[PDB]
Amino acid sequence: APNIRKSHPLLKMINNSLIDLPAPSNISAWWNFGSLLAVCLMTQILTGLLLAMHYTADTSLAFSSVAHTCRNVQYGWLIRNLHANGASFFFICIFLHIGRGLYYGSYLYKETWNTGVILLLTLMATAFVGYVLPWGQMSFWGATVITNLFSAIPYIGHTLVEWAWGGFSVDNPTLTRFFALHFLLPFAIAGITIIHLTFLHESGSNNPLGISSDSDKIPFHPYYSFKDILGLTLMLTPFLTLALFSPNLLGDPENFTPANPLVTPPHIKPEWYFLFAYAILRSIPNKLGGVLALAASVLILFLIPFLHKSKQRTMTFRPLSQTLFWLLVANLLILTWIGSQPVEHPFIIIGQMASLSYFTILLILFPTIGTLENKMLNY
Amino acid sequence: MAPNIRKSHPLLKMINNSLIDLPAPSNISAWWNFGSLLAVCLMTQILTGLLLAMHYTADTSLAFSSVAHTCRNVQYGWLIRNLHANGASFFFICIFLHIGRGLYYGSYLYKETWNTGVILLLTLMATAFVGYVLPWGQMSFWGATVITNLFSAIPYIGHTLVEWAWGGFSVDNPTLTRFFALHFLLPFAIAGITIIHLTFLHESGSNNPLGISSDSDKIPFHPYYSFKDILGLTLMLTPFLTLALFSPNLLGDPENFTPANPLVTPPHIKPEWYFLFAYAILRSIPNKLGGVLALAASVLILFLIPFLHKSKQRTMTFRPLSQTLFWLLVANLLILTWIGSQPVEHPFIIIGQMASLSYFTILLILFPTIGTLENKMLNY
Amino acid sequence: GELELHPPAFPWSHGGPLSALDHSSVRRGFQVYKQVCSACHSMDYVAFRNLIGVTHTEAEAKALAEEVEVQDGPDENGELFMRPGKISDYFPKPYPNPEAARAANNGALPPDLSYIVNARHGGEDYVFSLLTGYCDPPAGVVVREGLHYNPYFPGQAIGMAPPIYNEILEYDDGTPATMSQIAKDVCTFLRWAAEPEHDQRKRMGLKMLLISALLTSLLYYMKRHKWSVLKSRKMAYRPPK
Amino acid sequence: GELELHPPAFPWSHGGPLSALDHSSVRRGFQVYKQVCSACHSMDYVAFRNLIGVTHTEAEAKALAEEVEVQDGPDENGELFMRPGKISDYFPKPYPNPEAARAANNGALPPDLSYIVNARHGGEDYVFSLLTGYCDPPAGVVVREGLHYNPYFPGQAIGMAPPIYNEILEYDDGTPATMSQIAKDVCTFLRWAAEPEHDQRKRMGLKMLLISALLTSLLYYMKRHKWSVLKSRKMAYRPPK
Amino acid sequence: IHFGNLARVRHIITYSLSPFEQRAIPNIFSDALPNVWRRFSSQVFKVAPPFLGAYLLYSWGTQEFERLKRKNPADYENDQ
Amino acid sequence: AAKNVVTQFISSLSASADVLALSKIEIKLSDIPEGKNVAFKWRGKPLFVRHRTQAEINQEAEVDVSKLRDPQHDLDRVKKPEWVILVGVCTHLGCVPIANSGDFGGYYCPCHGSHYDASGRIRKGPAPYNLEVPTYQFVGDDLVVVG
Ligand code: HEC
Ligand code: HEC
Ligand code: HEM
Ligand code: HEM
Ligand code: HEM
Ligand code: HEM
Ligand SMILES: CO/N=C(/C(=O)OC)c1ccccc1CO/N=C(/C)c1cccc(C(F)(F)F)c1
Ligand SMILES: CO/N=C(/C(=O)OC)c1ccccc1CO/N=C(/C)c1cccc(C(F)(F)F)c1
Ligand SMILES: CCCCCCCCO[C@@H]1O[C@H](CO)[C@@H](O)[C@H](O)[C@H]1O
Ligand SMILES: CCCCCCCCO[C@@H]1O[C@H](CO)[C@@H](O)[C@H](O)[C@H]1O
Ligand code: FES
């Protein structure tokens, strides 16, 4: 082969996925999130390792090791900030990535979609175990509240839980296994991300009009490498602005207090990116039902590919679906909001409304409106 | 797409083109069984490693006892600990036979598969080095000290590089915690690089003991080699387990059953057997800087092998002079291993330099020379 | 018991995203802590050396640390013993453990202040409103013996007796030690104790913004430049027709 | 200077790959340790509960642990205090710290015995030779005051006076407490303290061998079976010649 | 696709039997062992030698090291 | 072979020996004076074992609280008469009630009120449920084994 970019067994790979890779000419900024998610992942792993090199997984030293890192390690405070806040940048990006997919029917690429669902699940597990590490009050209680949910599974209940804790409650044995899990999972994410992109390359990218872009493809480089680099700095600015000017904006002050099993914080609530699910959890008063609801709130994503009724791929030319789409987005902000609120009136009733509409829109309305729209096109 | 889903599917296709319909020479011997063992070995270290990691505490004040707590309280913690420590040795025995096979059969002529291989070895050594420090016993600490102090011998950037590595002025807690992170991490790089290793390899396919094209006679990896390899696995796995279950501490230093103490230097600071050969070469050059280079060279020398092939034939199967030279070298290595475990005194000192010298000579001068000589004896 | 009073937002001199801490105020705040709060409140994460180059001179810090006796050891016979403090020591603990602390405060536990302004919603505005907000309970409300009424404390019955009052101490810099002046200083000090990186963090923020502005603009032009080829591209359908 | 006497190999009842520890011997060994060695030697990694089902009854172990007072706390007033031992407590330390230990042994430090037989080359053969090997120094050799001559100790001048002698204690099982009998028992006990898993490990080893023998043969046949196709294969070159 | 593009091959016939028609380990004494011996024989003089030399050097050096630890009476013959 | 190796590795994740050693506590019933409440440490949290004198299975066992905030029926989940064993943790915010006071002679949580009777039931207070009653048994009367 003439150029070594195609013959070489490795460069060939780099070339067929980042240089001569055929990309639609009209993909928008919504397609910029895949790369941000990747970069985001590289960054979490990097700052993570740097933190891990100064952390001590022990109930008696965790809290202070994080403090020692922020107070003594050269730029430890900066690394800690970037890691904690990076987790949020990661979720913001992942939610927009998903949104883009629902709106544009990217889910029709079934395998790319399913691996994607798996990436999200793994990312959550990662952030959950990560959060416990500093061993502050919300660290401990959040760990407690969620893991206790599984004792609700009949039969294998108390077992699965005491197996997970490595004892009778969240304690040191839990902390150490959680550190190993936190260190490990990101690497599974990186792995699965490769599979994600592998299935994706079978078809290539979808585009905003939802029609074949074979008639007009352009090389990933320089078009998208530039577009993506730009998208990186555009997002990276607010990220840094937040982490450098308002470091604790998103965090709970309760975590600046060493965990204490003899003092339940008044309002045990998760980081923002889990609030929507926390709301759905509490919507079903009944330990077991709520757990299933929580599970279903995310597992529901595996069904999306089978609820597509439209004759068109995207929602670009489907105004009824478009509003339903934004209704859903608002539905989510509402759940997020309910999640941060105590379990009282009127939040309780509002919560069930939001939880119920959530599942209805995805399970019943979207497929239905899609069918309806097919008729209005005389199809 | 295609008839069977084993070829069309974007993933199974991968599994099929590397473990089922993969064309393999019909005559590869037991020496080709080490690649698969290395892989399995790697999966096992990672598995037992994680299980140990879930009960470990990277702190000078708790490390030693966390390992003890694991062995004494964790269900089968004692077994996992044994399998992990001894598995490291199974790993090196396998890696050394893997390399040997390669030298003897000219596998190194597959340059990229070879170079990634050298990288796998280096990464494996770093992994075991940092791993060894974790229990924080006496040999853990002093081995860490002895080796890391070698870099303060590097010119100008010396002292810096070292105090940077330790995260202070001596091997201490900051060193331990970063070593844990490295130990947890590197194995994953090994898995990664192993994929690249096999990827380059598949460009050519396996070499074989006669060193001639096997296109005229290839057989599917499965069932021929999947069976041969599974058999190879149990055959090796037996002595491994026999050792780990009947003579758990045969290979370890008793000195490591004592908590690290910076105020008491053990009498004989020596590494696990698989590093002895290199330790011998290190100590062969009295001169901090020269020894360090010699140590470095003892392994980096592997990157030159592809360029020192002079024979007109690939393997050594039909090269009797090279064959003896080859076993001379092997014996040379046992000797260095032996010298590595001995104190630095007469006659071990002089013997040591002889062995170190012959080591480099055989690979750098004799092998290429004898190869050329043999070419003439075939009237070539 | 329901209903809570939320503090107001005071205009701290270190509130602006680009505004550092008033180190002179931090220095006085240290004095307050050292002479008043340190009697019952521990500050485990700060050491005397931390003051150097921030609020005190190296000579000053060394003297401050020496005013304290620390327990070192064991010695030859495996005995603990006292010794004068070094700048590497951390601010001394008022009590051996929490049990002893509660024992000396009516079963109430004065928390470590190292991260207090971040461990409480409201931060310094909260701590400030609390210190200067003690008053008599409204009608219908009875404070059980040992507790003191404070509208700013949840439940309104705090176990800390008003810690500060006018002239309770003298600032050796000559500042008028009024009650609110004191609270203001100690709160500014608490901010610094919670995050010594404060100033550097903001100085970095400034640099991040400028570079971010510059670089984003530059990259925008480059993206546009390359894409101009497709943006201005024109096409036509010309069938043999 | 580099001279050293290497112990001989005694035929321990737990030396065979398939031979467990003699638990009756381990029980006596515990007594020796508890009544003799524990005076100066700590065994930090073993707890009374560990004896249960190995050498003692649960009732027996609970009584043994109660013979000891342990320091618990803090209490209400943040005070340390004593309490009777539970089977979850570990064997009591003879000294607070090493400094105090040397202080009471002429600057010599009696090491923790939890892993002694693995922290020394020779293991129990070494510990046994040592205990029963004290004797007078040979001509030309002088042992400095405070040290005792032992040919088995490196340097031959040990800081431990001969710890055991005939009838230094009475075995409540009625075994004749001769010096060598005692050493033998405590050494067997030490083996167990270093590796409680000892018996389970060997029982497992037995199972690993049988299964290994069975599975290997089976797999050998299968490999052979499949390869038979190639092994017996015949070929010929038939050119149109 | 690696099967079908390997080599240009002509006029070779091969005969093979199912594994179920034949024996797994045939002619152990008439063929196997003889060959095992044959294989050992053809290699022993290439492999053994250096290993034997290694052993010698090992023995020498070990014994020589111990001999140097012993005392030479010739250093005390006039110490009266 | 696989079944065993997997079993071993899997069980390496469940409670280790040191932990199981604190799994349960055995309390001697015949050493707990009447009326006088005694608290022990069990699983890091307080464990209440009070000996009901005579005016306890009566004064605080005949109460007529029509609508109860928690379906507390002693015949549902309890056992011994003069014996009451509770988990000394208020179900409000994890505080430990006190036996000295207790508006209803039982226990009082000095955190937000929460008054518990002699049977350890939420009376006057914010805490929803009643102090939890942990597993136990009397395979030896003069001894009880909680946990
Ligand atoms: C006599 C010891 C004592 C002194 C002196 C004292 N405090 Fe306290 N402080 C306490 C006690 C006791 C509490 C616990 C109150 C409670 O939780 O009921 C407390 C609590 C606090 C709290 C808030 C706790 C919360 O939950 O919000 C802050 C903040 C605080 N003190 C600040 C200070 C500062 C600043 C000073 C010096 C100006 C100071 N204290 C001096 C005894 C004292
Ligand atoms: C009076 C305290 C005391 C008693 C009692 C005692 N030892 Fe020791 N032991 C020591 C001292 C001191 C040392 C340190 C010796 C040295 O390093 O010079 C020691 C060292 C040892 C060593 C060997 C140290 C080495 O480096 O090899 C062993 C093993 C040992 N003791 C076993 C025992 C056993 C078993 C018993 C009970 C039969 C026992 N000791 C009872 C004081 C004692
Ligand atoms: C760590 C998480 C993830 C990484 C790193 C990742 C990465 C990527 C990348 C690089 C692309 C190509 C560029 C783009 O279209 O954005 C992509 C595409 C895609 N991903 Fe992800 N992804 C992640 C999570 C997910 C999730 C959670 C879903 C869905 C539940 C998902 C669904 C898809 C789909 C369906 C596409 C097709 C885009 C199209 O319509 O062209 N991905 N992803
Ligand atoms: C998928 C990427 C990752 C995510 C989403 C993530 C998320 C988190 C979260 C939410 C926290 C809590 C931060 C806080 O509030 O203090 C955390 C902490 C931590 N993470 Fe990660 N993490 C990731 C990767 C890693 C990796 C790869 C490592 C290192 C091998 C790591 C090491 C740590 C450590 C040591 C902490 C504790 C110190 C601290 O809390 O700041 N993380 N992580
Ligand atoms: C973690 C370490 C390694 C892994 C997992 C690994 C794995 C493999 C595998 C699976 C094969 C195919 C089967 C075989 O022929 O044995 C292979 C072949 C090979 N490997 Fe490695 N290897 C490792 C290290 C190395 C090293 C250190 C070298 C050389 C310095 C090396 C050189 C080669 C070469 C040259 C081949 C060609 C074999 C032939 O002649 O057909 N490998 N390796
Ligand atoms: C490439 C595979 C690996 C090698 C060659 C290796 C090697 C070692 C070695 C030589 C030791 C010291 C053993 C001893 O004598 O006590 C060790 C300890 C340890 N390794 Fe690994 N290891 C590997 C992978 C891992 C991984 C993936 C983890 C977990 C993420 C891990 C976790 C540990 C831990 C926690 C210890 C300390 C406990 C102990 O000393 O037994 N190892 N390893
Ligand atoms: C260890 O807890 N970590 C918390 C956190 O904020 O991490 C960022 C937290 C904090 C408070 C309450 C609940 C949670 C736990 O997260 N909450 C929910 C409700 C959740 C929802 C879905 C999935 C998952 C999981 F398991 F990660 F997969 C978790
Ligand atoms: C932390 O030390 N780990 C030791 C060990 O035995 O681990 C199994 C050890 C022990 C005693 C002396 C020297 C060593 C250090 O290893 N010694 C050598 C001589 C060495 C030689 C080459 C490369 C490397 C490295 F760095 F791993 F890459 C190390
Ligand atoms: C989007 C790209 C943002 C990069 C911003 C780089 C600014 C970091 O600048 C930092 O400022 C600190 C305070 O003065 C100094 O102490 C550091 O040495 C310096 O590197
Ligand atoms: C080559 C495959 C070897 C696998 C051998 C599996 C045998 C392990 O068997 C083990 O024996 C112990 C002693 O009885 C038991 O305590 C363990 O529970 C049991 O799993
Ligand atoms: S925790 Fe008991 S009354 Fe609130």
From TrEMBL, chains C, D:
Record GO terms (molecular function): electron transfer activity; heme binding; metal ion binding
Cofactor(s) needed for function: heme c
Domain (Cytochrome c): residue spans on this chain: 24-176
Cofactor binding description: Binds 1 heme c group covalently per subunit.
InterPro entries registered for this protein in UniProt: Cyt_c-like_dom, Cyt_c-like_dom_sf, Cyt_c1, Cyt_c1_TM_anchor_C
SUPFAM superfamilies according to UniProt: Cytochrome c (SSF46626), Cytochrome c1 subunit of cytochrome bc1 complex (Ubiquinol-cytochrome c reductase), transmembrane anchor (SSF81496)
List of residues binding Zn(2+): 121
Record-level GO cellular component terms: mitochondrial inner membrane
Keyword NADP found: no
Major localization class: mitochondrion
Gene3D superfamilies linked: Cytochrome c-like domain, Cytochrome c1, transmembrane anchor, C-terminal
Subunit structure as annotated in this protein's UniProt entry: Component of the ubiquinol-cytochrome c oxidoreductase (cytochrome b-c1 complex, complex III, CIII), a multisubunit enzyme composed of 11 subunits. The complex is composed of 3 respiratory subunits cytochrome b, cytochrome c1 and Rieske protein UQCRFS1, 2 core protein subunits UQCRC1/QCR1 and UQCRC2/QCR2, and 6 low-molecular weight protein subunits UQCRH/QCR6, UQCRB/QCR7, UQCRQ/QCR8, UQCR10/QCR9, UQCR11/QCR10 and subunit 9, the cleavage product of Rieske protein UQCRFS1.
Stated family: Belongs to the cytochrome c family.
Descriptive protein name: Cytochrome c
Organism annotation: Gallus gallus (Chicken)
From TrEMBL, chain E:
Membrane topology value: Single-pass membrane protein
Pfam families: UcrQ
Chief location of this protein within or outside the cell: mitochondrion
Single biological process term from Gene Ontology: mitochondrial electron transport, ubiquinol to cytochrome c
Transmembrane keyword on record: yes
UniProt-annotated location(s): Mitochondrion inner membrane
GO CC terms of this entry: mitochondrial inner membrane; respiratory chain complex III
Keywords from the named record: Electron transport, Membrane, Mitochondrion, Mitochondrion inner membrane, Respiratory chain, Transmembrane, Transmembrane helix, Transport
UniProt subunit comment: Component of the ubiquinol-cytochrome c oxidoreductase (cytochrome b-c1 complex, complex III, CIII), a multisubunit enzyme composed of 11 subunits. The complex is composed of 3 respiratory subunits cytochrome b, cytochrome c1 and Rieske protein UQCRFS1, 2 core protein subunits UQCRC1/QCR1 and UQCRC2/QCR2, and 6 low-molecular weight protein subunits UQCRH/QCR6, UQCRB/QCR7, UQCRQ/QCR8, UQCR10/QCR9, UQCR11/QCR10 and subunit 9, the cleavage product of Rieske protein UQCRFS1.
Task of the protein: Component of the ubiquinol-cytochrome c oxidoreductase, a multisubunit transmembrane complex that is part of the mitochondrial electron transport chain which drives oxidative phosphorylation. The complex plays an important role in the uptake of multiple carbon sources present in different host niches.
UniProt cross-references to PANTHER family, sorted A to Z: CYTOCHROME B-C1 COMPLEX SUBUNIT 8, UBIQUINOL-CYTOCHROME C REDUCTASE COMPLEX UBIQUINONE-BINDING PROTEIN QP-C
Similarity comment: family membership: Belongs to the UQCRQ/QCR8 family.
The protein, known as: Cytochrome b-c1 complex subunit 8
